[PDB]
């Protein structure tokens, strides 16, 4: 039994979503390993399977519910359970292939998709890019519904792919970035929904690159600056870890702590 964190979109407030994300982070990493003030996720290699995942239980005002499984190494969604079925993205190696069989063992039906959970593939299936897919409590509410109905036959592939894209960003990306968590709190605050702006999208795209640069950094300065975009799409470069401390909450482990 992996740890379970419960969140409802019903009556969702800025605080309840903040408490939720805080708790998700708390389960992803012990915080024992920090590098330049930024917590590093457990190193995949050597990690015992009984520690490998956490579970995120999502429910809405519709009183439908689904269970997401997150990999503690990258904080990313690997699959989910609705009712008597579990569904998993295509594992990219044998060792990942084996890991997920420890998820949702008592379900009647077990499916592995032909596709992975990367944005490029999901976008192709959903028929839309991330920048065309709106985010907020309303979109999460619908995504949860689409995911639950998939197990009953009421959800088509394109809507499923779209719902993944919504959940991954509002949960995984938000746990990874305080900045992305912030934009979600803002949507909830004004009770609005909107597609993510360029600052959100480029962060998402850059998480692995920023994990590497921060961990390989000499003294906190980057050998290669990292270009990001602001909300308005204008471009600027990050030369130093100091400016990302407010931005990025967790990193994938790239190397030994020295």
């Amino acid at each position: 039994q992996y740890p379970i964190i419960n969140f409802t979109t019903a009556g969702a407030t800025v605080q309840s979503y903040t408490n939720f994300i805080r708790a998700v982070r708390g389960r992803l990493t012990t915080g024992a390993d920090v590098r330049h003030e930024i917590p590093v996720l457990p190193n995949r290699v050597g990690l015992p399977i009984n520690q490998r995942f956490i579970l995120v239980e999502l429910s809405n005002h519709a009183e439908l519910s689904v269970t997401l499984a997150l990999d503690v190494t990258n904080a990313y969604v690997v699959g989910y359970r609705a009712g008597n079925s579990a569904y998993f993205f295509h594992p990219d190696n044998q060792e990942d292939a084996e890991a997920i069989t420890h998820l949702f063992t008592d379900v009647q039906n077990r499916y592995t998709f032909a596709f992975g959970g990367n944005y490029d593939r999901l976008e192709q299936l959903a028929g839309n890019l991330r920048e065309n897919i709106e985010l907020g409590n309303g979109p999460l509410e619908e995504a949860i519904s689409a995911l639950y109905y998939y197990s009953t036959g009421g959800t088509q592939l394109p809507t499923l792919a779209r719902s993944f894209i919504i959940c991954i960003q509002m949960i995984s990306e938000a746990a990874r970035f305080q900045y992305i968590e912030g934009e979600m709190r803002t949507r909830i605050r004004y009770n609005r929904r909107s597609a993510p702006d360029p600052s959100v999208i480029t962060l998402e795209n850059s998480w692995g690159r920023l994990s590497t640069a921060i961990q390989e950094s000499n003294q906190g300065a980057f050998a290669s600056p990292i270009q990001l975009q602001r909300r308005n799409g204008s471009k600027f470069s990050v030369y130093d870890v100091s400016i990302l401390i407010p931005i990025i909450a967790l990193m994938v482990y790239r190397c030994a702590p020295p």
């Epitope: 077990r110 592995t112 032909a114």
Partner: nanobody, 124 residues
Framework: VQLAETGGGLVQAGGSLRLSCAAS????????MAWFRQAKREFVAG????????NYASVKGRFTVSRDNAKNTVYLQMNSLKPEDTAVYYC??????????????????????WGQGTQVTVSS
């Protein structure tokens, strides 16, 4: 998706047939495949994307399922054929799932693409 099947027809008993099915355009190496048969439409054999996991129905120890991802082909090798095996055989696939485990393996509904059937008739 396009399918091309070979093998079928009349064979005697204790004798054998090989059914072959080529698929396209899809990503076949990523696709769960299955064989079904009718009279009277049920699951016969099925195989996952990497061919490390296979299921059989009545046919166990006789029929074996195989695939070559290089050719986008899936095979059914039928051995020790008995009159009760006479049926129309359909190759099925899923462009959605790489692996279908549990009950859903045998649901015709788990598979979103289907070849035309081939009559297989095993005489006494």
């Amino acid at each position: 998706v396009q399918l091309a099947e070979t093998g079928g027809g009349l064979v005697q008993a204790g004798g054998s047939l090989r059914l072959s099915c080529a698929a396209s355009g899809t990503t076949f190496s990523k696709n769960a495949m299955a064989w079904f048969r009718q009279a009277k439409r049920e699951f016969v054999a099925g195989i996952n994307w990497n061919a490390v996991s296979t299921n059989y129905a009545s046919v166990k120890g006789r029929f074996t399922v195989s695939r070559d991802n290089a050719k986008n082909t899936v095979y059914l090798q039928m051995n020790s054929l008995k009159p009760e095996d006479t049926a129309v055989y359909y190759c099925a696939g899923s462009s959605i799932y790489s692996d279908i485990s549990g009950a859903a393996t045998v649901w015709a509904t788990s598979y979103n693409y289907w070849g035309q059937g081939t009559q297989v008739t095993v005489s006494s």
